[PDB]
Design a protein around this ligand. Sequence first.
Ligand SMILES: Nc1ncnc2c1ncn2[C@@H]1O[C@H](COP(=O)(O)OP(=O)(O)OP(O)(O)=S)[C@@H](O)[C@H]1O
Ligand SMILES: Nc1ncnc2c1ncn2[C@@H]1O[C@H](COP(=O)(O)OP(=O)(O)OP(O)(O)=S)[C@@H](O)[C@H]1O
Ligand SMILES: Nc1ncnc2c1ncn2[C@@H]1O[C@H](COP(=O)(O)OP(=O)(O)OP(O)(O)=S)[C@@H](O)[C@H]1O
Lengths: 152, 621
Amino acid sequence: IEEMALSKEEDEASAERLAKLRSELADQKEKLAELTTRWQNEKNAKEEVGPDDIADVVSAWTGIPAGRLLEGETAKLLRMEDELGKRVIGQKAAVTAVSDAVRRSRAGVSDPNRPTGAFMFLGPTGVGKTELAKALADFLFDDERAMVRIDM
Amino acid sequence: QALQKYSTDLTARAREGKLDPVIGRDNEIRRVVQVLSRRTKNNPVLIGEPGVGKTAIVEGLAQRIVAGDVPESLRDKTIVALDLGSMVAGSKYRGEFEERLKAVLDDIKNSAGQIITFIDELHTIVGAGADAGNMIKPMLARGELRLVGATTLDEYRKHIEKDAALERRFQQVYVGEPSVEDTIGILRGLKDRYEVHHGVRITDSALVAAATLSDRYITARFLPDKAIDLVDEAASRLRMEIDSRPVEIDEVERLVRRLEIEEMALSKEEDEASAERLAKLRSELADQKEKLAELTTRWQNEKNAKEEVGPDDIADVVSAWTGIPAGRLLEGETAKLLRMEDELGKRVIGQKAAVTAVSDAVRRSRAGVSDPNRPTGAFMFLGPTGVGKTELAKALADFLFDDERAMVRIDMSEYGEKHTVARLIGAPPGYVGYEAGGQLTEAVRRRPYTVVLFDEIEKAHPDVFDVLLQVLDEGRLTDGHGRTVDFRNTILILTSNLGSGGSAEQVLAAVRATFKPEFINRLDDVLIFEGLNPEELVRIVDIQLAQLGKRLAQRRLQLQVSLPAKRWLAQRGFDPVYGARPLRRLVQQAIGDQLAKMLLAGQVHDGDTVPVNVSPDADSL
Ligand SMILES: Nc1ncnc2c1ncn2[C@@H]1O[C@H](COP(=O)(O)OP(=O)(O)OP(O)(O)=S)[C@@H](O)[C@H]1O
Ligand SMILES: Nc1ncnc2c1ncn2[C@@H]1O[C@H](COP(=O)(O)OP(=O)(O)OP(O)(O)=S)[C@@H](O)[C@H]1O
Ligand SMILES: Nc1ncnc2c1ncn2[C@@H]1O[C@H](COP(=O)(O)OP(=O)(O)OP(O)(O)=S)[C@@H](O)[C@H]1O
């Protein structure tokens, strides 16, 4: 509905805002086709509330992700370091430490009554020790502004 | 039939096509459905900041029911909009309100779940008593009445969470605010409803700007709501312009039709001092009647050979709002910016290195090049005394606002002890002065375009520096009330007097030993001022004499100054240790004293003109 009314804009500025709507619309048509096809495989080759639908409800409520790592997140969790490295540079001894405490809780291995991980950065001025926190708060929620931050 | 008196019909309103299209927010509505369709305790509550869309979700669900996208457990169910206000209307007697509410509840239960009561602003359900809004507590916990409520985030924990027996019967649904990409789509969907009400057209390049622009300027409000106002206002203004003449052809005519009456009732003044005012007003009238008739001509050049809103009306609206100028440099402002160190040079003399840096971070922000999240410019200039470093910060606040007292000055010499910080940030809750906020904070939260000036900063206690530490480099600091105030458009200026005579590294190393590297690093260039050469005082002399002359025109009283006296004063500007302050005392010792003596001793009256002349040593009038 967007793209079939955006094309008739007598302008050039939006002509590059249309050269992407088509792209994403196609890239999603592809996924819908694939998934609707997989539905046929499953229908030819669920019917009870298993143990993880409860976890899905606990996640829809309260926002906390407690699921089962549906095979698409586990790729992000292995590319975490190279994805942070697109915004911070060096300090890999700190990137590895920040990131390792997230998979350690996605695999359900960290202690259940303690913060998910709390550690302190310190070093010379203008090195990255505040850019890293903002780069980590964006990799998890996809918007840098959504962290509780207080200036001590 | 008792549900007809105290409620309208949401589903019927949605059937006749009276509600706005609801776009996106699939997850919220599906969770509302799968909560509204359980066995017991089947009543959700939407929760979230004001404006992010919480009645929009209920109206979307109603349109969805009318269409038929809902599951079998909800196909063909009507939504009634309960109205608690119209129930306590006449109930002065001792049981009438309870009787009404009981009839309503019995009638809701009398149906078989074909009704979904929807209470808006349900935090008002606690009162109604004088044992009220409490007889609903049994029927809630059993799932008889399906309740859909929506209150803001912070009246919940103020009226409901205080009553944990009642907030148990509610399932919370959090409604977070959308992003820019989603707001763009919401606007793309809502455009064609304003396109009709206002007889205009709206451009998609404007729908993108009304959402990108209203995300870095208006921070006190939340999303879509703070992005639909711009579109609506722009359209309404364009319709106004369509009917009448355009703007900047209307005000030029309104003030001309006023200067007429002014000069007309002024020309009948049997007075002599009023003749210089009438002969000055009579020139601006003929000057305005010039560009008015030029606009009426330049308008026909277009009207013979601006019909839909674009990314320009939006900027003009978000500029009339909030005062921040974010336009496009409409050829009248650019000609003024191009000669800025020329308009600043009429008040500050010398210091070319510093005037071409203050003036250099205004252009590169008006042309859209500076970082959109950091102050416009944050630099400290320091040097010896009386050089002109508190004057530049006032010649600058006058170029931008045309009023030297529209800026925010705080004299940092009163912050001698660290506890004097609470003066500019407020006092934490539960203390004496709390319903007053900060003092610097509340000054910028109302007009976020001023130019702040921290005068004599090294005289303070080295903790106020650490307060300023985050003002620079982020433009944010939050007061006691928890309101974050943005500084991303101000110009931060810090004067000083460190070093005091050191060439360049007796001062550059005295700054380094009084401030910390983490504080020097946020700053822009650290400007160094320089002493006054003998040549660049013969001009301050002229400035001072012009000032005094303008001060004397209250009596139509002039004075003629001869070049010998003008270069005598400048040669008696001495001691390159005190800068240009001694000269202002020399002027009043020489000229002002004896002028005032002659002025109240008769022998000089208004209208006269006294010539000064250098006697062999002194000045004689
Ligand atoms: N490793 C880095 N990768 C990318 N940008 C960096 C890096 N280090 C510093 N920066 C830049 O420096 C700025 C952020 O510096 P910060 O790390 O926030 O300063 P800081 O680490 O907080 O040090 P202080 O003592 O708190 S001022 C941004 O302009 C970043 O682009
Ligand atoms: N998803 C959406 N689709 C279309 N229009 C929306 C959407 N969300 C919000 N709006 C519009 O944005 C405005 C939001 O107003 P409302 O949501 O009714 O107020 P509110 O969000 O309930 O805030 P409160 O708590 O009621 S003051 C209205 O003009 C809605 O039409
Ligand atoms: N370069 C200058 N051009 C014009 N007036 C100047 C200049 N330097 C000083 N003055 C005059 O000096 C007065 C203001 O001096 P300031 O610069 O405010 O003193 P200062 O530079 O702040 O030094 P301190 O350390 O604050 S006492 C006004 O009367 C100005 O007219």
